[PDB]
């Protein structure tokens, strides 16, 4: 019916806005990125600080885990992405080619490719082993806000401030489909059939991408400025989860679109949220008046 998320830990350490939080696929870790140029690794269940990973020359907008939880990829204002060995903290590769800030990144399920989006309006596809750029897609006419592979890796979805969401064939780089307020976030649904898209008019929408039809709309939060992540919560009740510019985490019922919970505690915009892969745990993180990450746990 409704979850009962409750604050369990607050994680301090970043010295500027947090930009992204992500749980490792094996559930053990939370990774956070920040405008302070750092990645921090934390225990997913107790919030225990594990390590700082450093090397970018400017702030980081996004981080993403490989499928085996051993690698991380980061997107930076220094125009590069970096591939990191999480166990050693070492930079394995620096991915060079974007001509402006890199805003978003993800591995494919195989974790042999990375996709990135940039203020330079392109999407790039990179080889993980060599660190070389394989394709540059002239994807958008304004900064690219999000990029994500689907569940078999054959598709990429991208979104942009130009108002478009596009689906790309990974193998060829060619556009399969296009779907205008700025689109600030997109990702494929767990079952691969839907795309969840945020627009800077305080709206989330669930699209059937095959049919090109909007199936659900979620509102009541505040999102007119920032690229705020949204999530599917797959461990307990079927929820949509998002931060908000009124400093709250919002949780909706996937099917009824009703708000089922709002989490209070942050003291700045909640720019990022993540849902744990096996436990009913949310991580949230806020902009520079707050700079903390919060871990929330529910019984359902
Ligand atoms: C009931 C249902 N399941 C899906 N699949 S899903 O979006 O991928 C998905 C979301 C979540 Br939260 C958790 C899990 Cl486990 C999932 O599989 C869609 N819908 C309804 C049908 C019409 C659109 C909403």
Swiss-Prot record:
Effect of residue 288 to A: Strongly reduced affinity for histone H3. No effect on interaction with KMT2A
Protein name in the entry: WD repeat-containing protein 5
PANTHER family named in the record: WD REPEAT-CONTAINING PROTEIN 5, WD40 REPEAT PROTEIN
Gene: WDR5
Entry superkingdom: Eukaryota
Cross-link (Glycyl lysine isopeptide (Lys-Gly) (interchain with G-Cter in SUMO2)): 16
Location(s) in or outside the cell: Nucleus
Site note Important for interaction with histone H3, residues: 77, 103, 229, 288
GO MF term set: histone binding; histone H3K4 methyltransferase activity; histone H3K4me1 reader activity; histone H3Q5ser reader activity
Result after altering residue 103 to L: Strongly reduced affinity for histone H3
Phenotype upon changing residue 77 to N: Strongly reduced affinity for histone H3
Native organism: Homo sapiens (Human)
Record field: transmembrane: none
Effect of residue 77 to A: Strongly reduced affinity for histone H3. Significant decrease in interaction with KMT2A
GO cellular component, one term: mitotic spindle
Stored InterPro entries: G-protein_beta_WD-40_rep (IPR020472), WD40/YVTN_repeat-like_dom_sf (IPR015943), WD40_repeat_CS (IPR019775), WD40_repeat_dom_sf (IPR036322), WD40_rpt (IPR001680)
